[PDB]
RNA sequence: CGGUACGAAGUCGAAACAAGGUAGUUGAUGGUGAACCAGUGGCUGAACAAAAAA
RNA sequence: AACUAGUCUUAAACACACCGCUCGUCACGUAACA
RNA sequence: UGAUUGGUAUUGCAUGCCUGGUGACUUA
RNA sequence: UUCUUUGCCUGGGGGUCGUUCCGUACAGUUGUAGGUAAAAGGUAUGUUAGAGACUUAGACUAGCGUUGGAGCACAUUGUUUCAUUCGAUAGUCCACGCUCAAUCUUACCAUACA
RNA sequence: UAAUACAGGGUUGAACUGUGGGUUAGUUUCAAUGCCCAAGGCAGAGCACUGGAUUGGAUACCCAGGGAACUGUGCUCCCAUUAAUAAGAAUCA
RNA sequence: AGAGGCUUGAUAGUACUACCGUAAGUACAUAAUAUACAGUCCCAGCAGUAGCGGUUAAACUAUAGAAGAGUCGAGUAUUAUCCAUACAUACCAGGCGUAAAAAGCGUUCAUCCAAAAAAU
RNA sequence: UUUUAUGAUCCCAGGCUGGUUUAAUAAGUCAAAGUUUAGCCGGGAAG
RNA sequence: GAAGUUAUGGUUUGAAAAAAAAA
RNA sequence: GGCGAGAAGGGAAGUGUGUUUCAAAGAA
């Protein structure tokens, strides 16, 4: 959470990881949603 | 260990070092014995000896040796030893519950029986320092014979202790206030690792190498001094 | 956190925002064109001179020892 | 204090949960777990140091033999280092140039040793030059001062029996223009001592 | 390729810290040479102003 | 109703103390990853 | 009616002495 | 630093065939280079606030006079000269150093003597 | 957040019951706004954009107008993600 | 100096096995040296984080700078390796309001623990 | 029907074990894991 | 000769076979 | 003709190696 919060913050989770919240930009998901 | 010591260097004999102080620098300086305690047990010569016939006037005795080399079983020993024994005896001497209890205080105060030296003072055949003089140990039994009842020996414990007391024995104004004095005076290190030996570090110095230096330095001393003397009397006479 | 550390975070993802937003219009995919060993792999192993095997055995490694 | 034990995991769990700082000698990665390496020198110039200080750094960025490239810091003054130059690398970080962690050992390949050093010898590879072994051997020729007390005791106590260097016996004490004698079996011992066993 | 870290301080503005002179920042967005701006929903890691009772 | 000197309260990322601190593009070289 | 040991050259961002402006100076 | 059980953290910060799975897909991603001796929480004062309140102490106001409009004098600035010496430069420079310069004062310039 | 319909939870009491629990993934019901999709579509207000001003200058703050978004058993959980700083036992009258 | 290596700006208690203040290299010889000095001036350079060097440096270079000073010593220093001294790898022995850290709120499986601990 | 989050299916890397002394009221076995003569083990072939 | 014997690192990318059906 | 002879093996193997706890009879 620390070094994962501060990926999150800087902005590298929100280019690479794919979101079922979907978004513009963000990369989507294909695939059925469940909670990993 | 191995190498120089790296890291703090501090002198064993806990004196600080600086521009004004014992020390000019960081060491050790475990070679400089005046800086701890070595007590003289032994004499004392001078360097000149004003006699027209070596009759040895210059030795004496130095202060510490009288109590290096004491003497005991002096008067006054004698005198502490009886009226700390008449102390020392006066429980035994009043208890009033019986002989049993009797006994066993005495025993308390000074152990004894079969294969101990005692003194022997509770023993009905012991000479004591009564104040009111009663029968030894009513007519009917007694020693017919005359019998004189034999010494007390010293109780060894209190004897001892009495003479080393004397190892711990120890021996208007221009009214000008201080100011600049304090309220609780201080105890450096300096004070404790003068006197208490075990605190102070162990050397890792080879012993040659200290005798080495000792040999050095009953060389070089004497060229030092007379560096810095010269250096004086050369100034004095430049100024003349 | 507070708000002034906030502000850097702020920053650099706002950048990597915009600047992905930048090539979203394109199209074309771009195209973009080792003896050293790293401080792990190195750390695996035990240089110390032991009899003979180099990395042959678990006093020769830094894995778990099961004891 | 034993909440980290948790549990039928914690064999597999805790020891996860440690700390993760980096290595103590990190710093020098590069070596791959050597005391040194050897490595060509792609570059060489001169670096500006961070601020506060200011000055000119002597710098390298050298191919170790295991391929990597490296900065590496020239110490002491002066250097005849040039591409294609071959030194020896060791661990060593110099501060004010950024990102250098390793320094190169003198007197070893191409890197001369430090010209005009007398201290700090064998951290720059200079040897103890002939005058210098010569110096510590004649360095020690005792000298002969007094300071009068010499003078007065002579003259009071060792004057009436004295022998010469040559055995010969004084009859009057010291004058004016006469030094103190030296005494013929302690004077300068040590370095006689050391003349007479060469030879 | 785009981005990133170090040295340098050059041009352009003045976005934040005071009500920072339009409160700040956040989720996903739209727009813009640059910091940024606008709407919407969150928070406070914000202010201003602030009741007697008929 | 305004100003200076205070004096009081609040806020502060200022403490060389708002002539403070401080953000970014562009330009400029040395590099790693890709 | 009793003369003297160079520089009114730089450096007030080396200082002493001396000033300007603003602040203070409360006790039993 | 009473006890039970899950979740997470290791200074700061940066970049980044496994699938007889539908493949520009699914699943998965804090971690390796390059920088770093700091970073960041609070209380205590000061300073500031295009923040607020207050004493009404000065400021305003009111009264007596000014100055900016014209002439002269001083200083300063601009110009010029071989030189028109120099300092002072918001308040705290500008009738100031210089409480008085035709000679001297003079420290500026020109000439010729050492 | 009036009434009505259908469901909880909480509180109080009686009865029943009799260690029947605390925590919880190879678990999945729900969950602001935005975005994708679908609906409708001009009550209000309102990105982008237009033009009326201020500014050396503004792509803004101010004004007028405005076809993006504002109601879904869908897709769906990114967050300064919802009553707080995880849940339970013990210590208190 | 029977000998060299390293230090010669501050900073580290320099450990520790028997002794545990129960003594003399005690006195004389025998009293000291370096925040003295010289070369360089944000250069050359040094250093361990901090830092030093701005033309009068106990911090760079120099030890005939003096028979200089501190330690170890036939050795000594640098680099490297670690279970790298309590950068407690935190069971002994760290944390999750504000400084890194409580999952968005919840329902459960397995494990774990509770209530007849130890014994049965 | 058999395995499987107590890690099945399924890649790469590593044989395991012992060594007496061992300072500190840190030891009566060196005390989660650090070794050094050694212990145990490590196919078959003239077809 | 037998019976018991915690796995570790490379970040890992959960179901694998048999059987049934298929042609 | 008879005995002995592995340059004293690190080439295989992860739930393996080894370790710990045991057990092992001819002349029945």
Redesign the interface.
Known sequence: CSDRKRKILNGTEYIRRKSSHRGRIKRGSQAPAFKR | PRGSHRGGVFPVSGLTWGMNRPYLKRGLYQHRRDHIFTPRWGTRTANFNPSALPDGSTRRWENDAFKAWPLYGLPHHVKLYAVNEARYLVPAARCTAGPEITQYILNQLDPGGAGRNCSGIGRPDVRLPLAKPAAPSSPDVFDPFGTPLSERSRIKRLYNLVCEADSWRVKNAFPFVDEKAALVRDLPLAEILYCRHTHRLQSRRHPFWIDMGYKKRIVRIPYLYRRRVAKEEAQEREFG | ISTCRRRY?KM???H??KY??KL?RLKKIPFVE??????RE??LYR?QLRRGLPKKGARKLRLHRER | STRSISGRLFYKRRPLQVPKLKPPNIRSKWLEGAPQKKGICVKVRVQTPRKPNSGLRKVARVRLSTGRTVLVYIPGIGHNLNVHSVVLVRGGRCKDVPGCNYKAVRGVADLLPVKNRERKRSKYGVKLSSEKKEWRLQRWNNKHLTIEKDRELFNQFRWMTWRNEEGEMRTSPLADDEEVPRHTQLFNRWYRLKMQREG
């Not at chain 3, 080792?34 to 401080?39: C, G």
């Open positions: 975070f650099r993802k706002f990597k925002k992905k937003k979203m080792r003896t050293w060993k790293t401080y190195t750390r240089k």
